[PDB]
Write a protein that binds this ligand. Sequence first.
Ligand SMILES: Nc1nc2c(ncn2[C@H]2C[C@H](O)[C@@H](COP(=O)(O)OP(=O)(O)O)O2)c(=O)[nH]1
Ligand SMILES: [Ca+2]
Ligand SMILES: [Ca+2]
Ligand SMILES: [Ca+2]
Ligand SMILES: [Cl-]
Ligand SMILES: [Cl-]
Ligand SMILES: [Cl-]
Ligand SMILES: [Cl-]
Ligand SMILES: [Cl-]
Ligand SMILES: [Cl-]
Ligand SMILES: [Cl-]
Ligand SMILES: [Cl-]
Ligand SMILES: [Cl-]
Ligand code: NA
Ligand code: NA
Ligand code: NA
Ligand code: NA
Length: 326
Amino acid sequence: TLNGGITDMLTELANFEKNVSQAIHKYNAYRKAASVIAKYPHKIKSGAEAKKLPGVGTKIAEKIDEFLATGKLRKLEKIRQDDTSSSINFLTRVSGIGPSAARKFVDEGIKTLEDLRKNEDKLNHHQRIGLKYFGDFEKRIPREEMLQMQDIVLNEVKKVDSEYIATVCGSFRRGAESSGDMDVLLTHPSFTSESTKQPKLLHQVVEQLQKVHFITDTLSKGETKFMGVCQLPSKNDEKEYPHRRIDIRLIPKDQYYCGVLYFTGSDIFNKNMRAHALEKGFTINEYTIRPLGVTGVAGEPLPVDSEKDIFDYIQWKYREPKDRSE
DNA sequence: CCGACCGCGCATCAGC
DNA sequence: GCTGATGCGC
DNA sequence: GTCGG
Ligand SMILES: Nc1nc2c(ncn2[C@H]2C[C@H](O)[C@@H](COP(=O)(O)OP(=O)(O)O)O2)c(=O)[nH]1
Ligand SMILES: [Ca+2]
Ligand SMILES: [Ca+2]
Ligand SMILES: [Ca+2]
Ligand SMILES: [Cl-]
Ligand SMILES: [Cl-]
Ligand SMILES: [Cl-]
Ligand SMILES: [Cl-]
Ligand SMILES: [Cl-]
Ligand SMILES: [Cl-]
Ligand SMILES: [Cl-]
Ligand SMILES: [Cl-]
Ligand SMILES: [Cl-]
Ligand code: NA
Ligand code: NA
Ligand code: NA
Ligand code: NA
């Protein structure tokens, strides 16, 4: 909230380029500019001041000078008044509708939540589920509920096999008072990078959580990534709990630390961390960190014993999850 | 004054 | 079936 | 849109 006006302004322009113009690199440019302004420890006074930061160029500095002088931005006033632009934006908020499908619907005259429910035969399984819980998925999750959900997941995993290990990540791990959804990192001695000694390791766990009626729906599912829906049990004659998005990612036991770093985030922290890695000569994904060659290829993975080891390779002071909250 | 931009899981489509 | 691309998501 | 090749 230090420079809250500017970073809100740029986040709004970022969404317009992603969802309407389908310019993903203009989207990423606006998120970078808003995120560096957010870490800047002063109240900004001019476009020429902001231009000194990396990722603010001539055009964004001219927009900050308009906003500080007038309290508004004209380009965002036209965007906000364009019906077609604003319909396309709203549609992408449904799980499973992106910019491509949102523009095709709007070109076909489908432009409200009522229009969607009337045209359910134009939607795939994913989009239909995202429409079903649309209001529920717009809601935050209090840390007190995340606590109960974690107790249920850890207890049932232990009943399947006591050698599984499950860890709640995402914004919860970063200490947030509320989260957007629940993210679970899972490992088992039988799935390593070297060998898969047992079948259906992820399937076995989804199944047990379905049979005690914790998981309620599947958006997508493979051998390592599950994307779906879940719900806490309610008491007699109390309002049910909102349904919630859940993601479970099975990672090889020996690559747990790269995996838990990716899964803890945030998204723009990850993006900035991997960009810095590149200018230091490495590449980071959720499995490994590797160095790059003169060709550009990645070499063999480097040993890792902790989250801190990865910050060390790229020469970063360690950051506890609560300070990765960009 | 043009050409790249973090990295990948799952579902589906074109050309073969 | 496969590549390689599009689309949507973490 | 920005930065760097
Ligand atoms: N490299 C990279 N990592 C990402 C990206 N999006 C998400 N991740 C990671 C960081 C997130 O904390 C984690 C879970 O996704 P999320 O639930 O949308 O984020 P969150 O609100 O819990 O932080 O996935 C992404 O776009 N790029
Ligand atoms: Ca998530
Ligand atoms: Ca989350
Ligand atoms: Ca995100
Ligand atoms: Cl772009
Ligand atoms: Cl307005
Ligand atoms: Cl009608
Ligand atoms: Cl809320
Ligand atoms: Cl389902
Ligand atoms: Cl399900
Ligand atoms: Cl798979
Ligand atoms: Cl890898
Ligand atoms: Cl670049
Ligand atoms: Na700059
Ligand atoms: Na309008
Ligand atoms: Na969406
Ligand atoms: Na992709």
